[PDB]
């Protein structure tokens, strides 16, 4: 999950520069077009100490992918608009042949 | 589904324009179309899973797009041509994959170069075992990823370096990587828990040292004793190291005896169990 | 025993909370995949249309 | 004897599972004739053929004791080759068998006259191939044994 | 002197059932994030090979005016 | 201006003229404007909840786009038209999904094709239940996902191949399938803890097979047998074929209840378990 959430940085890398290209490529189109129980009492507590590992990483591992959902909240609209902008710029970039 | 006649009729079309063939304008539309012709020609072999012939037929279209003035998708056509002998068993995907990175870097660029450079490294480690080359590929790739501030893959490709470079011979470049990643990992809230096993690996790497180099990093390390996860960081080492100094190889097995149960042991650490007892027996007999 | 029971019960409902997260996650993972594939063809045919453009005005 | 690839199958009924015969089809080989099943270089096992009308040509039917001796089950690739015995020093003249009831939910203490059993034994398993340690089952007065 | 053993049986098998439940929701979870994880590898092409179309194209669109 | 008017107004302009209305060109500039009218129309048919002239309008938006020069975005609109009839009541999305794969494969874009090659298998298994052809799409699509090296995509498809080999009752092929994929999971630490279950699938697929393949494929799986999911995976299986080769259905059907108490079984597993449950009874009585 760490490495896949850190891939999100290269996702950002792609989307910002594509978005950059579409603000500039916007320009060229119009420019060109127009006791074991007492051991058990310790074993159960050995695991009571382990459930610390459980609850700590549990509470921790919750928040990250929520943060990733906000990172996705970045991705979604800047992707959908860019899907629109590529197609309109492309249809313009095909109608200027003549 | 005409694979043959395309290849022959494009022979006069893979043709520069100084002739009656030239006419008025260039032949840079003809060869441009021909690239798609050879692509489709390889495509209809590929569909019949003739990948061996298909990749060589894609080498045509991928070669001819460069000829017009386009490194742009000719490198994508090399990626495509490499997918043939990558998916197909035999070689020379190695060639087109080396063609693609040099072309992307000759575009003035960095990312996709490293992206396929580790693909080459995967081939040259997993298939064509050339660790002395593929490890250098991960090294350079990680160097580019530092040049992109995706320390993500800067750390990943270096873990791929050091995990094998350690058992091979080299325990210092190893801990260099494993301290680099652990120290850059206590920074992030995403990374600090991966840093536990990273400083563990940074601690494990011994040049047959009978000293506390693992426990040395521990005396640096942020165990945070209430956090029991670092018993998989030091408590192993805490127990076995005294054994190693004080004539107790026999006691050394009883650590993995339980740690293999509370953590199923992989190849690297198990081979390291054998390797650091090669350091035992190179203190005792070897 | 009862303290430990409750302490486990914490992680129990927290597991259910992380599944309550995956109910959103799977949706996000799907819809990002829905556009990821979609953009490559719009990009390749845009490169094609621009190829038609650049040949007219050498 | 050159050896043909065969597919290990299951014994059709209980009668031939009481014969310890590598049950085959009449389409391929002949009852009485002996063969040698090969599974690997380190496993060569010898069997008696007893054809049967419900075998698929190209597959050999084996019973559970023989498979539990042969380490075989339904639908495995094996090489079956005709094997001809040497009747100079391989015809059986004296053979000890360790016997015991097969199914442990019908154990009794009744006596079974061995002279009658051994006589009916040869009357049933004549011209059959028996190796040391080979395991099978014998039917004496409608009773399952583990031989 | 047996009812506390029956609790030692019952409350702790209950506890083990809490373990079973969280471990089963976790053999869900590990596989949830597992199965999601490769979709990122599906992006892995469409994230920069997509850029390989975009920048390599607009380097031409800006040269298409010329 | 309604969606119904767009169809007939595009019908005016679709005419292939050869007159002073044409001049020298045909209607190559006009087949795009027609496609544009349908690009708006197919959009707003769904807005009126038509769902059936919707899908036909999504078809028509690309149908005329074929004749221009461009199958590609026409193909995307075929996929969209398949998203019309699919969500709608009738079929014929399945047709446009043929129309799509026959185009994207005709360039080499196997992944985009495979996005809905699987969805074709989804309709042909859920709706138009054609499980030999549905599996001919899961397995074939898995071959495409491995064409671009994505192993886990093909493991997802091949579990549809082999998962429904139980309901297709092809246990001999199911045991042929779950082996290589679990071996591909022992390598992966990302995937290992389902690998025991993967070989359990290969293990449990019995047609009353008493090969020790069932007792050996679990042995192949490198395994610390006092591990924590193995008590519910492997020794389980040994207990279950302890009773099958006992010729006893009593303990065979006691341990299945012993196990469901600790991990609730599902339709596929439980069906396979009662499939083998009939196999003991098919030999004890008769």
Residue numbers in the entry:
A (entry chain H): 50 to 83, 141 to 204
B (entry chain K), F (entry chain L): 8 to 293
C (entry chain J): 32 to 89
D (entry chain D): 1 to 147
E (entry chain I): 191 to 256
Reported in the publication:
After fusion, NSF—together with several molecules of an adaptor protein, SNAP (Soluble N-ethylmaleimide-sensitive factor Attachment Protein)—binds to the cis SNARE complex, forming the so-called 20S complex and disassembles it in an ATP-dependent manner. NSF is composed of an N-terminal domain (N) and two ATPase domains (D1 and D2).
Refinement of the class that appears to have the best-resolved density for the entire 20S complex (Class IV) without symmetry restraints yielded two reconstructions of 20S complexes (FL-20S-1 and FL-20S-2 at 4.4 Å); each reconstruction reveals density for a 20S complex which differs from previous reconstructions in several key ways. Regarding substrate loading, both FL-20S classes reveal a spire in which the N-terminal end of the SNARE complex is positioned over the D1 ring by two αSNAP molecules, each of which is in turn bound by two N domains. In the second class, the N domain is shifted by one protomer counter-clockwise about the hexamer axis, with domains B and C engaging the first αSNAP and domains D and E engaging the second (right). This difference results in a 53.2° rotation of the αSNAPs and SNARE complex about the hexamer axis. Finally, and most important, density consistent with the N-terminal residues of SNAP-25A runs from the tip of the SNARE complex to the center of the D1 ring, where it assumes an extended conformation at a 61.0° angle relative to the plane of the D1 ring. This interaction is preserved in the FL-20S-2 reconstruction as well, with a slight difference in the unstructured region of SNAP-25A running between the structured region of the SNARE complex and the D1 pore entrance. Despite the variation in spire configuration between these classes, there is little difference in the interaction between SNAP-25A and the D1 pore or in the overall configuration of the D1 and D2 domains of protomers A–E. Previously, four αSNAPs were found associated with all T-20S complex classes; in the case of the FL-20S reconstruction presented here, only two are present, similar to the structure of the V7-20S complex.
